[PDB]
């Protein structure tokens, strides 16, 4: 029975789970785009958002500095976290990460996903785009909208 359990059981235990997520998140902070098993990316997305929030908190915040020191195993990324990512997202309030499924791993056919920080310098992902507004159905719905607006 796992009603309400929100954390996956990963690695060799709770500590190993935290360390795996920490390594994935350090890689994400360094490269701004990381491909990894789908479940691990899903688990680490929340921690990535939380680091962005802690970076928003600021350098002077000792709690934020301690959190960054723990979570970024490569200490050169803490200045990055506090001076490149948080300033980038200062305007935003959330949704700093884009996660998209990827064709299964060639080795073990594992469900993989790519997670990136939005606005990175890397080439854009082939994002799935909704159907154009000029399609038949979309044009009919536009006619509906125009008729309703004219009525009101």
């Amino acid at each position: 029975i796992s009603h309400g359990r929100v954390f996956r059981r990963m690695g060799l235990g709770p500590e190993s789970r935290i360390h795996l997520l920490r390594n994935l998140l350090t890689g994400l902070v360094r490269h701004e785009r990381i491909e990894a098993p789908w479940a691990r990316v899903d688990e680490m997305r929340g921690y990535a958002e939380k680091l962005i929030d802690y970076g928003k908190l600021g350098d002077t915040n000792e709690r934020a500095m301690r959190m960054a020191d723990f979570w970024l195993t490569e200490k050169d990324l803490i200045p990055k976290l506090f001076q490149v990512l948080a300033p980038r997202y200062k305007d935003q309030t959330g949704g700093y990460t884009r996660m998209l499924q990827i064709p299964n791993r060639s080795l073990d056919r594992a469900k993989m996903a790519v997670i990136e920080y939005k606005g990175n310098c890397l080439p854009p992902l082939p994002l799935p785009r909704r159907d154009s507004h000029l399609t038949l159905l979309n044009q009919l719905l536009q006619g509906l909208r125009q008729d309703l607006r004219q009525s009101q």
Binding site: L77, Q83, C121, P124
Partner: protein, 108 residues
């Protein structure tokens, strides 16, 4: 426990050809409008993703060459500039990664 009798090929065929065993046809496959290769609707296109990954690998190799060593991550934003392209006012004050090729059409 050991089998009491050999199970016949008829029973075995029943078991291993029960539709629960058979592979299910997938109806979520579709053509990628960009390159025309097949892709699952929810999954990203393999061909396009490989294009992006190879371009990312080139850019990252240039990034590593410019960094010159471990633990040298910049404290400023980064911009990738291709041949025949000059930094803009926004690009000013950002680390320039120069790629020795024309900017990909998909890349913007």
């Amino acid at each position: 426990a050991a089998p009491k009798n050999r199970r016949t090929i008829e029973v075995n065929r029943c078991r291993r050809r029960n539709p629960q065993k058979l592979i299910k046809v997938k109806n979520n496959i579709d053509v990628c409008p960009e390159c025309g290769h097949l892709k699952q609707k929810h999954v990203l296109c393999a061909y396009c993703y490989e294009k992006v990954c190879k371009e990312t690998a080139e850019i990252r190799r240039q990034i590593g060459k410019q960094e010159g060593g471990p633990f040298k991550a910049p404290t400023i934003e980064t911009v990738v500039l291709y041949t025949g392209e000059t930094p803009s006012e926004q690009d000013q004050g950002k680390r320039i990664i120069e790629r020795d090729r024309k900017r990909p059409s998909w890349f913007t």
